[PDB]
Design a protein around this ligand. Structure first.
Ligand code: APR
Length: 165
């Protein structure tokens, strides 16, 4: 219903403006998984993330930041802070789903009208950007995807997601 499942590399470049959503940690570790691959291609976008994580630390749980790709005018990256440390040191599954859910709240409100880093970098109306993500949390975090799926399901009629399998 709310979701549209796609097969492919979310990282392969697209031709429409979009917002990439991935779950993150408060530790300033763009360590492994798809977080790390966004750190290689978008180093400017990493530096903002590390810098935000020392300024505010574990204060970002349940919150999201939108920061620009810098390499692509049409790609905005969006972190949802769901856990306080990257890697196997992660929080337990209930919080990460609670913290995913709150964080996506902050996004939804933002489009209906985080983005300190965005000044000048926002080519299009924010509601024109498509939202894409991998199966965030189904890897390092370990949260099965059924679980995270239904949080996105309960944002139906608010936002629509393209998910990359
Ligand atoms: N090269 C890769 N290329 C494309 N997609 C990938 C790749 N690696 C992983 N993915 C997909 O990205 C999704 C999530 O990426 P993860 O690496 O698993 O990160 P995740 O566990 O979802 O959540 C972020 C977590 O990382 C920690 O730092 C912290 O605990 C934070 O909560 C998974 O569905 C996984 O299938």
């Amino acid at each position: 219903s709310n979701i549209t499942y796609v097969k492919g590399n979310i990282l392969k470049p697209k031709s429409y403006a979009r917002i990439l959503i991935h779950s993150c940690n408060c530790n300033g570790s763009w360590g492994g998984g798809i977080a790390y691959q966004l750190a290689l291609r978008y180093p400017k976008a990493e530096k903002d993330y590390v810098e935000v994580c020392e300024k505010y630390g574990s204060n970002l749980l349940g919150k999201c930041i939108l920061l620009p790709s810098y390499e692509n005018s049409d790609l905005l990256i969006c972190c949802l802070f769901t856990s306080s440390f990257g890697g196997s040191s992660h929080g337990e599954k209930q919080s990460i789903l609670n913290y995913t859910k709150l964080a996506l709240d902050k996004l939804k409100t933002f489009r209906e009208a985080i983005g300190d880093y965005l000044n000048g970098h926002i080519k299009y109306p924010i509601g024109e950007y498509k939202l894409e993500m991998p199966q965030i949390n189904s890897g390092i975090a370990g949260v099965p995807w059924k679980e995270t799926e239904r949080v996105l399901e309960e944002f139906s009629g608010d936002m629509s997601f393209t998910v990359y399998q």
